[PDB]
């Protein structure tokens, strides 16, 4: 699809048996989701943006479905104010910026 | 042009006659640049990021060129980790997300 930027680019995602709303974010290196349970081992990480840093749990090889496209990658879980789909998963669905 | 997301979508911008590097960020409602001098009056604005909120200076009707595309709009100045081109200016240059 072609997603305009007149509004925030929010999409429905499917992850760990849950349906969540998330923002397609080209400015984010990583995918960051609000607190939720995920399977497997995890490692702590600090991620920073505007306002400073937050502590998150890093889960690897997580299956996530975005607009019918199945993608696998690292998902960060923590106290983010908005669910973000970062470049690590956008590349997997073939997402590009065009102008 | 078409920009893939395997690397950060950093582009050259021109503002106040000077070249700077900025990130095309579909996850940002607004354009936020590192400390610099801009003409005229400014208004206060609070913007929220992954780590919390920051105070910035809002300047309106500012000429800014992005990849050679001329835009005139709102530019925020403050303590950002990187210069960010947000949706307010991405819409002016006809930028969309595609997959
Ligand atoms: C070590 O890598 C980083 O620290 N990466 C930062 C990152 O990906 N942060 C995740 C949230 C970004 C989202 C972006 N959209 C709004 C919600 O916040 C990243 C950064 C890039 C270039 C230079 C320094 C920083 C960035 C980018 C934008 C704003 C703030 C920070
Ligand atoms: Cl990944
Ligand atoms: Cl590709
Ligand atoms: Cl604007």
mmCIF file of C-alpha atoms and ligand atoms in Angstrom:
data_model
loop_
_atom_site.group_PDB
_atom_site.id
_atom_site.type_symbol
_atom_site.label_atom_id
_atom_site.label_comp_id
_atom_site.label_asym_id
_atom_site.label_seq_id
_atom_site.Cartn_x
_atom_site.Cartn_y
_atom_site.Cartn_z
ATOM 1 C CA UNK A 1 0.000 0.000 0.000
ATOM 2 C CA UNK A 2 0.842 3.718 -0.195
ATOM 3 C CA UNK A 3 0.629 5.350 3.241
ATOM 4 C CA UNK A 4 0.321 9.108 3.327
ATOM 5 C CA UNK A 5 1.790 11.220 6.112
ATOM 6 C CA UNK A 6 -1.101 13.684 6.604
ATOM 7 C CA UNK A 7 -1.825 11.578 9.758
ATOM 8 C CA UNK A 8 0.409 9.417 11.983
ATOM 9 C CA UNK A 9 1.115 6.154 10.043
ATOM 10 C CA UNK A 10 -0.615 3.788 12.500
ATOM 11 C CA UNK A 11 -1.009 0.110 11.632
ATOM 12 C CA UNK A 12 -2.455 -2.979 13.301
ATOM 13 C CA UNK A 13 0.209 -5.555 14.129
ATOM 14 C CA UNK A 14 -0.079 -9.203 15.364
ATOM 15 C CA UNK A 15 2.541 -10.256 17.995
ATOM 16 C CA UNK A 16 2.786 -12.924 20.757
ATOM 17 C CA UNK A 17 -0.918 -13.803 20.464
ATOM 18 C CA UNK A 18 -1.957 -10.094 20.772
ATOM 19 C CA UNK A 19 -3.287 -7.347 18.383
ATOM 20 C CA UNK A 20 -1.706 -3.941 18.944
ATOM 21 C CA UNK A 21 -1.661 -0.548 17.128
ATOM 22 C CA UNK A 22 1.837 0.707 16.200
ATOM 23 C CA UNK A 23 3.481 3.567 14.341
ATOM 24 C CA UNK A 24 5.582 2.893 11.167
ATOM 25 C CA UNK A 25 8.686 4.842 12.229
ATOM 26 C CA UNK A 26 11.566 5.483 9.813
ATOM 27 C CA UNK A 27 13.402 7.493 12.510
ATOM 28 C CA UNK A 28 13.640 4.452 14.834
ATOM 29 C CA UNK A 29 16.470 1.926 14.483
ATOM 30 C CA UNK A 30 14.551 -0.606 16.610
ATOM 31 C CA UNK A 31 10.993 -1.779 17.239
ATOM 32 C CA UNK A 32 9.769 -0.822 20.737
ATOM 33 C CA UNK A 33 6.509 -1.981 22.298
ATOM 34 C CA UNK A 34 4.700 -1.233 25.561
ATOM 35 C CA UNK A 35 4.946 -3.844 28.385
ATOM 36 C CA UNK A 36 3.847 -7.319 27.276
ATOM 37 C CA UNK A 37 4.911 -10.904 27.738
ATOM 38 C CA UNK A 38 7.177 -12.446 25.048
ATOM 39 C CA UNK A 39 8.729 -15.952 24.834
ATOM 40 C CA UNK A 40 12.405 -16.860 25.201
ATOM 41 C CA UNK A 41 15.475 -15.291 26.760
ATOM 42 C CA UNK A 42 15.995 -11.539 26.925
ATOM 43 C CA UNK A 43 18.750 -9.060 27.679
ATOM 44 C CA UNK A 44 18.486 -5.557 29.185
ATOM 45 C CA UNK A 45 19.155 -2.531 26.971
ATOM 46 C CA UNK A 46 18.934 1.272 27.284
ATOM 47 C CA UNK A 47 17.389 3.130 24.338
ATOM 48 C CA UNK A 48 17.352 6.877 23.900
ATOM 49 C CA UNK A 49 15.278 9.372 22.006
ATOM 50 C CA UNK A 50 13.917 12.803 22.624
ATOM 51 C CA UNK A 51 13.506 13.199 26.402
ATOM 52 C CA UNK A 52 16.264 10.777 27.331
ATOM 53 C CA UNK A 53 16.580 7.033 27.810
ATOM 54 C CA UNK A 54 14.349 4.175 28.913
ATOM 55 C CA UNK A 55 15.304 0.639 30.062
ATOM 56 C CA UNK A 56 13.831 -2.120 27.873
ATOM 57 C CA UNK A 57 14.007 -5.937 27.548
ATOM 58 C CA UNK A 58 15.483 -7.099 24.258
ATOM 59 C CA UNK A 59 13.858 -10.224 22.700
ATOM 60 C CA UNK A 60 15.326 -11.722 19.543
ATOM 61 C CA UNK A 61 13.781 -13.716 16.631
ATOM 62 C CA UNK A 62 10.203 -12.552 17.322
ATOM 63 C CA UNK A 63 7.530 -13.245 14.677
ATOM 64 C CA UNK A 64 5.314 -10.233 13.933
ATOM 65 C CA UNK A 65 2.694 -9.650 11.227
ATOM 66 C CA UNK A 66 2.239 -6.107 9.789
ATOM 67 C CA UNK A 67 -0.513 -5.542 7.117
ATOM 68 C CA UNK A 68 -0.437 -9.251 6.134
ATOM 69 C CA UNK A 69 3.406 -9.264 5.840
ATOM 70 C CA UNK A 70 5.171 -11.753 8.161
ATOM 71 C CA UNK A 71 8.492 -10.456 9.506
ATOM 72 C CA UNK A 72 10.956 -11.762 12.102
ATOM 73 C CA UNK A 73 13.280 -9.630 14.241
ATOM 74 C CA UNK A 74 14.309 -8.118 17.550
ATOM 75 C CA UNK A 75 11.576 -6.495 19.643
ATOM 76 C CA UNK A 76 12.285 -4.182 22.565
ATOM 77 C CA UNK A 77 9.730 -4.129 25.398
ATOM 78 C CA UNK A 78 9.414 -1.344 27.934
ATOM 79 C CA UNK A 79 7.795 1.908 29.023
ATOM 80 C CA UNK A 80 7.513 3.542 25.583
ATOM 81 C CA UNK A 81 4.688 6.155 25.250
ATOM 82 C CA UNK A 82 3.821 4.757 21.769
ATOM 83 C CA UNK A 83 4.292 1.385 20.049
ATOM 84 C CA UNK A 84 6.922 1.849 17.321
ATOM 85 C CA UNK A 85 7.796 -0.342 14.296
ATOM 86 C CA UNK A 86 11.423 0.511 13.557
ATOM 87 C CA UNK A 87 13.703 -0.006 10.561
ATOM 88 C CA UNK A 88 14.746 -3.498 11.696
ATOM 89 C CA UNK A 89 11.185 -4.755 10.790
ATOM 90 C CA UNK A 90 10.268 -2.118 8.118
ATOM 91 C CA UNK A 91 13.029 -3.464 5.829
ATOM 92 C CA UNK A 92 11.545 -6.992 6.104
ATOM 93 C CA UNK A 93 8.139 -5.926 4.740
ATOM 94 C CA UNK A 94 9.836 -3.987 1.867
ATOM 95 C CA UNK A 95 8.889 -0.563 3.259
ATOM 96 C CA UNK A 96 10.459 2.445 1.510
ATOM 97 C CA UNK A 97 10.195 6.282 1.657
ATOM 98 C CA UNK A 98 9.271 7.895 -1.692
ATOM 99 C CA UNK A 99 9.088 11.499 -2.911
ATOM 100 C CA UNK B 1 13.739 9.251 -5.111
ATOM 101 C CA UNK B 2 13.110 5.924 -3.296
ATOM 102 C CA UNK B 3 14.885 5.468 0.051
ATOM 103 C CA UNK B 4 15.294 1.988 1.556
ATOM 104 C CA UNK B 5 15.626 1.537 5.342
ATOM 105 C CA UNK B 6 18.646 -0.793 5.695
ATOM 106 C CA UNK B 7 20.529 2.308 6.956
ATOM 107 C CA UNK B 8 19.268 5.448 8.680
ATOM 108 C CA UNK B 9 17.434 7.713 6.154
ATOM 109 C CA UNK B 10 19.854 10.635 6.706
ATOM 110 C CA UNK B 11 19.664 13.357 4.065
ATOM 111 C CA UNK B 12 21.270 16.735 3.518
ATOM 112 C CA UNK B 13 19.083 19.764 4.271
ATOM 113 C CA UNK B 14 19.781 23.491 3.822
ATOM 114 C CA UNK B 15 18.581 26.043 6.397
ATOM 115 C CA UNK B 16 19.820 29.609 6.886
ATOM 116 C CA UNK B 17 22.226 29.066 3.955
ATOM 117 C CA UNK B 18 23.987 26.133 5.692
ATOM 118 C CA UNK B 19 24.050 22.422 4.963
ATOM 119 C CA UNK B 20 23.120 19.990 7.779
ATOM 120 C CA UNK B 21 22.340 16.243 8.020
ATOM 121 C CA UNK B 22 18.821 15.274 9.164
ATOM 122 C CA UNK B 23 16.805 12.098 9.650
ATOM 123 C CA UNK B 24 13.537 11.557 7.715
ATOM 124 C CA UNK B 25 11.288 10.411 10.595
ATOM 125 C CA UNK B 26 7.731 9.272 9.844
ATOM 126 C CA UNK B 27 7.281 8.715 13.608
ATOM 127 C CA UNK B 28 7.698 12.440 14.339
ATOM 128 C CA UNK B 29 4.766 14.844 14.031
ATOM 129 C CA UNK B 30 7.217 17.801 13.944
ATOM 130 C CA UNK B 31 10.657 18.841 12.669
ATOM 131 C CA UNK B 32 13.220 19.282 15.477
ATOM 132 C CA UNK B 33 16.747 20.606 14.923
ATOM 133 C CA UNK B 34 19.792 20.954 17.176
ATOM 134 C CA UNK B 35 20.572 24.418 18.698
ATOM 135 C CA UNK B 36 20.969 27.087 15.972
ATOM 136 C CA UNK B 37 19.999 30.661 15.171
ATOM 137 C CA UNK B 38 16.716 31.353 13.336
ATOM 138 C CA UNK B 39 15.088 34.735 12.494
ATOM 139 C CA UNK B 40 12.050 36.360 14.106
ATOM 140 C CA UNK B 41 9.987 35.504 17.143
ATOM 141 C CA UNK B 42 9.547 32.074 18.676
ATOM 142 C CA UNK B 43 6.783 30.406 20.724
ATOM 143 C CA UNK B 44 7.111 27.730 23.418
ATOM 144 C CA UNK B 45 6.391 24.094 22.631
ATOM 145 C CA UNK B 46 6.648 20.851 24.605
ATOM 146 C CA UNK B 47 7.390 17.723 22.558
ATOM 147 C CA UNK B 48 7.250 14.094 23.736
ATOM 148 C CA UNK B 49 9.830 11.480 22.836
ATOM 149 C CA UNK B 50 10.683 7.944 23.865
ATOM 150 C CA UNK B 51 12.363 9.196 27.077
ATOM 151 C CA UNK B 52 9.907 11.899 28.138
ATOM 152 C CA UNK B 53 9.247 15.581 27.278
ATOM 153 C CA UNK B 54 11.583 18.452 26.257
ATOM 154 C CA UNK B 55 11.079 22.220 25.814
ATOM 155 C CA UNK B 56 11.797 23.588 22.360
ATOM 156 C CA UNK B 57 11.590 26.954 20.528
ATOM 157 C CA UNK B 58 8.982 27.039 17.764
ATOM 158 C CA UNK B 59 9.751 29.137 14.667
ATOM 159 C CA UNK B 60 7.132 29.436 11.910
ATOM 160 C CA UNK B 61 7.307 29.985 8.116
ATOM 161 C CA UNK B 62 11.004 29.006 7.920
ATOM 162 C CA UNK B 63 12.602 28.199 4.554
ATOM 163 C CA UNK B 64 14.184 24.769 4.593
ATOM 164 C CA UNK B 65 15.397 22.716 1.624
ATOM 165 C CA UNK B 66 15.301 18.877 1.938
ATOM 166 C CA UNK B 67 17.212 16.939 -0.784
ATOM 167 C CA UNK B 68 16.794 20.012 -3.010
ATOM 168 C CA UNK B 69 13.001 20.178 -2.349
ATOM 169 C CA UNK B 70 12.073 23.632 -1.007
ATOM 170 C CA UNK B 71 9.691 23.706 1.982
ATOM 171 C CA UNK B 72 8.467 26.619 4.164
ATOM 172 C CA UNK B 73 7.131 25.644 7.544
ATOM 173 C CA UNK B 74 7.467 25.165 11.281
ATOM 174 C CA UNK B 75 10.876 24.277 12.656
ATOM 175 C CA UNK B 76 11.468 23.455 16.364
ATOM 176 C CA UNK B 77 14.914 24.044 17.928
ATOM 177 C CA UNK B 78 16.056 22.129 20.983
ATOM 178 C CA UNK B 79 18.021 19.313 22.624
ATOM 179 C CA UNK B 80 17.437 16.485 20.196
ATOM 180 C CA UNK B 81 19.775 13.475 19.752
ATOM 181 C CA UNK B 82 19.635 14.150 15.935
ATOM 182 C CA UNK B 83 18.101 16.641 13.525
ATOM 183 C CA UNK B 84 14.668 15.243 12.575
ATOM 184 C CA UNK B 85 12.440 16.017 9.589
ATOM 185 C CA UNK B 86 8.898 15.239 10.779
ATOM 186 C CA UNK B 87 5.565 14.813 9.040
ATOM 187 C CA UNK B 88 4.852 18.547 8.867
ATOM 188 C CA UNK B 89 7.682 18.890 6.230
ATOM 189 C CA UNK B 90 7.592 15.318 4.796
ATOM 190 C CA UNK B 91 4.028 16.153 3.504
ATOM 191 C CA UNK B 92 5.360 19.386 1.889
ATOM 192 C CA UNK B 93 7.907 17.395 -0.152
ATOM 193 C CA UNK B 94 5.270 14.756 -1.148
ATOM 194 C CA UNK B 95 6.820 11.946 0.906
ATOM 195 C CA UNK B 96 4.863 8.684 1.414
ATOM 196 C CA UNK B 97 5.599 5.188 2.843
ATOM 197 C CA UNK B 98 5.289 2.308 0.372
ATOM 198 C CA UNK B 99 5.311 -1.517 0.586
HETATM 199 C C1 LIG C 1 22.042 4.420 19.245
HETATM 200 O O1 LIG C 1 20.916 4.601 18.387
HETATM 201 C C2 LIG C 1 20.001 5.507 18.855
HETATM 202 O O2 LIG C 1 20.081 6.119 19.917
HETATM 203 N N1 LIG C 1 18.956 5.608 17.961
HETATM 204 C C3 LIG C 1 17.866 6.537 18.196
HETATM 205 C C4 LIG C 1 16.635 5.678 18.115
HETATM 206 O O3 LIG C 1 16.420 4.939 17.160
HETATM 207 N N2 LIG C 1 15.823 5.843 19.224
HETATM 208 C C5 LIG C 1 14.523 5.199 19.318
HETATM 209 C C6 LIG C 1 13.364 6.174 19.329
HETATM 210 C C7 LIG C 1 13.290 6.964 18.041
HETATM 211 C C8 LIG C 1 11.865 7.258 17.650
HETATM 212 C C9 LIG C 1 11.927 8.049 16.359
HETATM 213 N N3 LIG C 1 10.577 8.591 16.040
HETATM 214 C C10 LIG C 1 9.829 9.220 17.171
HETATM 215 C C11 LIG C 1 9.878 8.261 18.343
HETATM 216 O O4 LIG C 1 11.259 8.073 18.666
HETATM 217 C C12 LIG C 1 17.817 7.651 17.151
HETATM 218 C C13 LIG C 1 19.124 8.315 16.827
HETATM 219 C C14 LIG C 1 19.508 8.375 15.498
HETATM 220 C C15 LIG C 1 20.701 8.990 15.161
HETATM 221 C C16 LIG C 1 21.514 9.537 16.136
HETATM 222 C C17 LIG C 1 21.138 9.484 17.460
HETATM 223 C C18 LIG C 1 19.940 8.877 17.795
HETATM 224 C C19 LIG C 1 16.748 8.677 17.370
HETATM 225 C C20 LIG C 1 15.947 9.009 16.297
HETATM 226 C C21 LIG C 1 14.946 9.948 16.418
HETATM 227 C C22 LIG C 1 14.768 10.579 17.629
HETATM 228 C C23 LIG C 1 15.579 10.274 18.703
HETATM 229 C C24 LIG C 1 16.569 9.319 18.583
HETATM 230 CL CL1 LIG C 2 16.223 -7.427 14.096
HETATM 231 CL CL1 LIG C 3 15.186 -3.910 -0.502
HETATM 232 CL CL1 LIG C 4 4.703 23.319 9.087
#
